[PDB]
């Protein structure tokens, strides 16, 4: 909840897939063949309102493999809409 790693599995796969699908739909790096997602796959709750503060959503920073090229995707989830979206797709970047 507070900067924690999530279980890689169908859930994470789906979000990484969605990230690649969005990226592919834009065509910014043409059309890549999503493979999987691997660590790190870190999530944090996202607030807004300020001052008083209020929960608004979450963010997910994960390393997605597509066409055997590893990219970092940052995804948002807005609580109220209850919908995710790609914040950014950086890379290719090698693992440490």
UniProtKB/Swiss-Prot annotation:
SUPFAM superfamilies: Cystatin/monellin
Matching InterPro entries: Cystatin_sf, Monellin, Monellin_B, Sweet-Taste_Mod_sf
Superkingdom per UniProt: Eukaryota
Record-marked site positions (Blocking, abolishes the sweet taste): 41
Applied biotechnology uses: Natural monellin has not been mass marketed to the food industry, primarily due to the challenge of large-scale purification of the protein which is relatively sensitive to heat or acid treatment.
Pfam family, one: Monellin
UniProt KW keywords: Taste-modifying protein
Record's function text: Taste-modifying protein; intensely sweet-tasting protein.
Subunit and interaction comment: Heterodimer of an A chain and a B chain.
Annotated protein name in UniProt: Monellin chain B
Organism: Dioscoreophyllum cumminsii
Lineage: Eukaryota, Viridiplantae, Streptophyta, Embryophyta, Tracheophyta
């Amino acid at each position: 909840g507070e900067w924690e790693i999530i279980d890689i599995g169908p859930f994470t796969q789906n979000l990484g897939k969605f990230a690649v699908d969005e990226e592919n739909k834009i065509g910014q790096y043409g059309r890549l063949t999503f493979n999987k997602v691997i660590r790190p796959c870190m999530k944090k709750t996202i607030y807004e309102n300020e001052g008083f503060r209020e929960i608004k959503g979450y963010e997910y920073q994960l390393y997605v493999y597509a066409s055997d090229k590893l990219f970092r995707a940052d995804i948002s989830e807005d609580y109220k809409t209850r919908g995710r979206k790609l914040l950014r797709f950086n890379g290719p970047v090698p693992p440490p």
